[PDB]
């Protein structure tokens, strides 16, 4: 295609401290390493420029970052990974006019070994049915990586579109993930059904886990 | 010692203008070399990073083909401000703004050619919702066992949760709100407990959202 388009790999990077890390960014088409920059970004702030021009650190910078590469592919290497270095990293295309363009993220994260979620389903509140809405909650507690799959089922119909997930970042103490996943119901149409099933598949579960439960039961 | 601060109103219902200014503190708008270049980048949440558009130190306005039909970047030169105007906002323009400086590219062969100066950003929530307290909803546990609360229905951010006034802290899970379709925002904070004392201890959630000056303690008994 004819526009510039920056794809990084790996899409996730997990790591401890003290390896070194390897960050690539492709480009469509062959770039001058001029217009080639790399930033960090930690969560709940703004993005700060490591690299620019390919391989020249900016004000500040420790030595352990590094940039290397020409035309189509550029590296960015950490040696000796620090714990401040857990972040995500962008690269950017910046020419000799706009429009510029940025790759679309490398999320470095802690390495742990592979855990199973522990699933939980939560049937809603009387307290909430009294009002008209019925909202079933799924919880996937302390799990890695953070790759998970929550199918909702409602009568054995897999459900779509109507459910909304989020995850916490990294636990500080065991570098596991939580998930949420809230599935909302009017309460008209959740009376209508029985058997309410949250299925997870996770790469620490030799078969997909089900946690449901039967309405008024 | 170079900086950026950033100022304009984040809490937009659809169809409105967002409108965000930039100063500039520590250079000129041209720079020394004219050779300034003023840019605003986009991040939806959860997402990466997206480039809006760019005034250089001549005045030349590029912007994003995504944005080029309703963004004005514009500049006052007097003042060393700079601005960006989105007209017709909807939910696909909620993110965190931020503006930044780079640098041109001539005579690159000889400081940093890139955006090395950020501001703070400004967290932009496109909604159709008002001020509004949340409800708080029990997630009662059915030998590891789980209860949590819901804080359901509120805006805007943020809410705090608690668990026994702070008593309780190992094996607490608050996850990120997600923003309803409502333009409500919904919340749950859930926590691991030992199953053999579901019968003695007593575990109760205190949800407080100051915009709305709502304070609700919410206990989670079992079914």
């Known amino acids: 295609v004819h526009e510039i388009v920056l794809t990084q790999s790996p899409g996730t990077l997990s790591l401890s401290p003290g390896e070194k890390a390897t960050l690539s960014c492709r480009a469509s088409?062959?770039?001058?390493?001029?217009?080639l920059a790399w930033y960090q970004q930690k969560p709940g702030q703004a993005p700060r420029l490591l690299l620019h021009q390919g391989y020249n650190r900016a004000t500040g910078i420790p030595d352990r970052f590094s940039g290397s590469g020409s035309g189509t592919v550029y590296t960015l290497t950490i040696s000796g990974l620090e714990p401040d270095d857990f972040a995500v990293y962008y690269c950017?295309?910046?020419?000799?006019?706009?429009?510029?363009?940025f790759g679309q993220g490398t999320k470095l994260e802690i390495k742990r070994t592979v855990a199973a979620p522990s699933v939980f389903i939560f049937p809603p509140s009387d307290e909430q049915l009294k009002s008209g809405t019925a909202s079933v909650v799924c919880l996937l507690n302390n799990f890695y990586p953070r790759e998970a799959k929550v199918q909702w089922k409602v009568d054995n119909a897999l459900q779509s579109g109507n459910s909304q997930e989020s995850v916490t970042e990294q636990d500080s103490k065991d570098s596991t993930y939580s998930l949420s996943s809230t599935l909302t119901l009017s309460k008209a149409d959740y009376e209508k059904h029985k058997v309410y099933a949250c299925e997870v598949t996770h790469q620490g579960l030799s078969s997909p886990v089900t946690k449901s439960f039967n309405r008024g039961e | 010692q170079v900086q950026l601060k950033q100022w304009g109103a984040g809490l937009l219902k659809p169809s409105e203008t967002l409108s965000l200014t930039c100063a500039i503190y520590?250079?000129?708008?041209?720079?020394?070399?004219?050779?300034?270049?003023w840019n605003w980048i986009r991040q939806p949440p959860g997402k990466g990073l997206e480039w809006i558009g760019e005034?250089?130190?001549?005045?030349?306005?590029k912007y994003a083909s995504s944005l080029k039909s309703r963004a004005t970047v514009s500049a006052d030169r007097s003042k060393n401000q700079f601005s960006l105007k989105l007209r017709s906002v909807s939910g696909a323009d909620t993110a965190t703004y931020y503006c930044?400086?780079?640098?041109?590219?001539?005579?690159?062969?000889?400081?940093?050619?890139?955006?090395?100066?950020w501001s703070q950003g400004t967290p932009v929530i496109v909604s159709s919702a008002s001020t509004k307290g949340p409800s708080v909803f029990p997630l009662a546990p059915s030998g590891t066992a789980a209860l949590g609360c819901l804080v359901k229905d509120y805006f805007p951010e943020p809410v705090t949760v608690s668990w026994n006034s702070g008593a309780l802290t190992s094996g607490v899970h608050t996850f990120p709100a997600v923003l309803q379709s409502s333009g409500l925002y919904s919340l749950s904070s859930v926590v691991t407990v030992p199953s053999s004392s579901l019968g003695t201890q007593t575990y109760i959630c205190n949800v407080n959202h100051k915009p709305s000056n709502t304070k609700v303690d919410k206990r989670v008994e079992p079914k």
């Open positions: 950017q295309h910046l020419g000799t006019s706009p429009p510029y363009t």
């Open positions: 520590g250079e000129s708008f041209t720079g020394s070399w004219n050779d300034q270049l």
């Open positions: 930044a400086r780079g640098r041109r590219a001539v005579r690159w062969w000889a400081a940093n050619y890139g955006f090395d100066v």
């Open positions: 005034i250089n130190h001549s005045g030349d306005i």
């Open positions: 088409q062959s770039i001058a390493s001029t217009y």
